Motif scaffolding. Structure first.
Motif, PDB file in Angstrom:
ATOM      1  N   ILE A  50      33.424  33.943  30.474  1.00  0.00           N
ATOM      2  CA  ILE A  50      33.436  35.030  30.881  1.00  0.00           C
ATOM      3  C   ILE A  50      33.704  35.334  32.482  1.00  0.00           C
ATOM      4  N   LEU A  88      36.610  37.408  34.179  1.00  0.00           N
ATOM      5  CA  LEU A  88      36.745  38.635  34.820  1.00  0.00           C
ATOM      6  C   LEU A  88      37.241  38.364  36.494  1.00  0.00           C
ATOM      7  N   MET A  93      40.508  38.402  36.887  1.00  0.00           N
ATOM      8  CA  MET A  93      41.226  39.460  36.565  1.00  0.00           C
ATOM      9  C   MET A  93      41.043  40.581  37.801  1.00  0.00           C
ATOM     10  N   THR A 150      43.964  40.509  40.687  1.00  0.00           N
ATOM     11  CA  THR A 150      45.010  41.176  40.350  1.00  0.00           C
ATOM     12  C   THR A 150      44.901  42.446  40.962  1.00  0.00           C
ATOM     13  N   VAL A 151      43.899  43.041  40.806  1.00  0.00           N
ATOM     14  CA  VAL A 151      44.009  44.443  41.624  1.00  0.00           C
ATOM     15  C   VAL A 151      44.016  44.336  43.111  1.00  0.00           C
ATOM     16  N   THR A 171      50.044  44.938  34.253  1.00  0.00           N
ATOM     17  CA  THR A 171      48.732  43.946  34.103  1.00  0.00           C
ATOM     18  C   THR A 171      47.650  44.858  34.978  1.00  0.00           C
ATOM     19  N   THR A 172      47.914  46.023  35.678  1.00  0.00           N
ATOM     20  CA  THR A 172      46.762  46.597  36.324  1.00  0.00           C
ATOM     21  C   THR A 172      46.033  47.400  35.597  1.00  0.00           C
ATOM     22  N   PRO A 210      45.487  46.933  32.499  1.00  0.00           N
ATOM     23  CA  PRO A 210      44.537  46.201  31.512  1.00  0.00           C
ATOM     24  C   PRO A 210      43.681  45.166  32.714  1.00  0.00           C
ATOM     25  N   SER A 211      44.003  45.259  34.088  1.00  0.00           N
ATOM     26  CA  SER A 211      43.088  44.869  34.906  1.00  0.00           C
ATOM     27  C   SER A 211      42.101  45.765  35.410  1.00  0.00           C
ATOM     28  N   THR A 212      41.987  47.061  34.955  1.00  0.00           N
ATOM     29  CA  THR A 212      40.968  47.898  34.984  1.00  0.00           C
ATOM     30  C   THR A 212      40.314  48.349  33.588  1.00  0.00           C
ATOM     31  N   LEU A 265      40.222  46.043  30.951  1.00  0.00           N
ATOM     32  CA  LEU A 265      39.514  44.836  30.652  1.00  0.00           C
ATOM     33  C   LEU A 265      38.409  44.578  31.552  1.00  0.00           C
ATOM     34  N   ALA A 266      38.403  44.887  32.819  1.00  0.00           N
ATOM     35  CA  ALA A 266      37.419  45.080  33.865  1.00  0.00           C
ATOM     36  C   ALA A 266      36.309  46.030  33.426  1.00  0.00           C
ATOM     37  N   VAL A 281      35.075  43.662  29.749  1.00  0.00           N
ATOM     38  CA  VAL A 281      34.185  42.456  29.968  1.00  0.00           C
ATOM     39  C   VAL A 281      32.839  42.730  30.449  1.00  0.00           C
ATOM     40  N   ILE A 282      32.779  43.824  31.480  1.00  0.00           N
ATOM     41  CA  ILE A 282      31.427  44.110  31.705  1.00  0.00           C
ATOM     42  C   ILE A 282      30.608  44.654  30.328  1.00  0.00           C
ATOM     43  N   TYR A 299      30.877  43.621  27.512  1.00  0.00           N
ATOM     44  CA  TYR A 299      30.460  42.333  26.921  1.00  0.00           C
ATOM     45  C   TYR A 299      29.324  41.841  27.532  1.00  0.00           C
ATOM     46  N   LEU A 338      25.204  41.197  25.985  1.00  0.00           N
ATOM     47  CA  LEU A 338      25.072  39.728  26.020  1.00  0.00           C
ATOM     48  C   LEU A 338      23.741  39.157  26.417  1.00  0.00           C
TER      49      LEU A 338
END
Lengths: 154, 116
Positions: free
Chosen positions: A140, A144, A147, A150-151, B94-95, B97-99, B101-102, B105-106, B108, B112
């Motif tokens: 994980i 992260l 990713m 990329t931004v 991608t960006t 998804p790069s927000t 997914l950002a 993932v948090i 997740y 956890l």
């Protein structure tokens, strides 16, 4: 540390008790048995100590001891990440086969015998949930941290 | 029949009414399918001449083909309806998804380690 100082053996010859407790502050730490074997209470006494500190020091030792710099903003050996992921799952299979081995001797002898009896050979349970955590946090973070760049970078 | 692409049978029913007039209803139905064909020209087709899509509805040659040919594209040309089948710009994101997914993932990481 346990800083000490002599007591006079003259008063031990007098049979008289020194040091005249006026405060519930002395008999708070129990003395060690080895110093009790030594001169302990017949030639010296203990002293309760403590420390002086300030946030001027606390911050500048806390904020400086273990500090990464920009390291989590990297990618960690990008070919060998998935390769290491393989390199855990592969034996995690056979370890799960041992988890398909170790459950089946329940509805059997008592779990205390299933406690003493398991001191020669490994168990799949704890060893399994170790590797699940290692794969989880191993993946994980790389996801992260992969990713955000990329931004941030264009 | 309006559910599937039965169109011609629907315009047969249009008229093939056995019950009564129903005229006010089949004129709303005459329209709410006029914009439907007026969207159906807008799929990836070839150069349609001034006869085929001219006769798909119920017209010979009024300026209703100018109403739709100037309303939308497939513009009046040399026996020509123009295909602007572009569909180009929207991929390679991608960006977003790069927000998102950002976020995920948090999300997740919250359920956890943080005890709930």
């Amino acid at each position: 540390i346990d800083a000490f100082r002599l007591i006079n053996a003259n008063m031990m010859v007098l049979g008289h008790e020194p040091r005249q407790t006026t405060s519930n502050l002395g008999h708070l730490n129990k003395p060690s048995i080895q110093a009790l074997i030594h001169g302990l209470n017949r030639h010296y006494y203990s002293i309760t100590i403590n420390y002086r500190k300030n946030e001027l020091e606390q911050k500048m030792l806390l904020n400086l001891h273990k500090k990464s710099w920009m390291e989590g903003l990297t990618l960690q050996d990008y070919s060998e990440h998935c390769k290491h992921n393989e390199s855990v799952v592969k034996e995690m299979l056979e370890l799960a086969k041992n988890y398909n081995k170790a459950v089946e001797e329940e509805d059997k002898m008592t779990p205390e015998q299933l406690a003493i009896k398991n001191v020669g050979k490994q168990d799949p349970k704890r060893h399994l949930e170790e590797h699940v955590d290692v794969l989880m946090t191993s993946n994980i973070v790389q996801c992260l941290a992969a990713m955000l760049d990329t931004v941030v970078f264009k | 029949y309006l559910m599937e692409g039965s169109y011609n049978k629907v315009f047969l029913a249009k008229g093939n009414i056995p019950a009564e007039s129903y005229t006010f209803f089949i004129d709303i139905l005459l329209d709410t399918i006029r914009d439907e064909i007026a969207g159906c020209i807008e799929k990836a087709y070839e150069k349609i001449l001034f006869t085929e899509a001219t006769r798909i509805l119920f017209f010979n040659t009024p300026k209703k083909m100018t109403d739709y040919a100037k309303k939308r594209g497939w513009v009046l040309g040399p026996n020509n309806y123009y295909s602007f089948a572009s569909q180009q710009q929207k991929p390679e994101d991608t960006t977003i998804p790069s927000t998102e997914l950002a976020k995920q993932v948090i999300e997740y990481a919250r359920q956890l380690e943080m005890i709930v």
